[PDB]
Every structure is written in C-alpha cells, then in structure tokens.
C-alpha cells in the first residue's frame, strides 16, 4: 500500500503540500480534481459518529483517489494508490484508513514541532517530506527487486 502521492489542503483549501515519494504534473491534477469533491454540495464527508471517514472519491488513469476531512480543524487529506494494486478487502480499507491517521498524526507532530513551531513555512514543508520519506519511499532494495 505505497501512496502514489499524499496531498495536504488547509482549513482555507490552500495546499500545505503535494507530495510524490519514487508526474507532477498528474498528481497536481489529481489533488485539484480532489479539492473539487471538497467543494461539491452533494459530498458527505462524516459518518453519523465523530470517527473520521475515509473516503473513496475518484479513478483516474490507474491511480485510485481517497480523500478525508477532518471535520474540526478543517484538514483535508488526499492519498491516491494504484489501482490494480488494491484487492478491496476489509483488511485493506482498515490499512489505509491506518496510513491517513498516521499521515495526519505526522502532520500535527510536525507543525507542532518545538522548533518547527517558530519557523518558516519551508521549514515545516522540508520536514514532512523527510517524514513521509521514512514512511513511503522505496528502499534500494525495494526497487532492484
Ligand atoms: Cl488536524
């Protein structure tokens, strides 16, 4: 279950950032087509309990688009997978659901970093990359097989 990219949108639907772990172009289209599912008037994006809801909002050219808002701060979180990838099994819903908590957790830990906290905007965007990086880039290792 490694995320073709992982997008972050702020409160305000600013973008906090697109990442992409080994095009741009794509997932950059990917991520507005999503922010445009946030917009719509006919998406209900909570369940009837306060637990947030994953959703699966979208395909596209092999990528399998799901998306989360977090209903409080606003957050919104967009990951997509390949698609021929995915068997749909419960099992793996819960995977994913774990991998949008733990982005989201990894998100908080960041912009609430002690040092973090009084930096610049690069500053927080450098260090989720290198977080996401521990999590979702493949190893040398990976690729050669
Ligand atoms: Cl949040």
Redesign the pocket.
Known sequence: LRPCFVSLIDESDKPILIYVPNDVLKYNVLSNISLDYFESALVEWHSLDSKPLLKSIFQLEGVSVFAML?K??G?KIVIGFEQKSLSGADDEFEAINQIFETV?KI??RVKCNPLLVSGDEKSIIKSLERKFDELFISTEVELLA
């Open positions: 977090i409080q701060t957050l989201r998100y908080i």
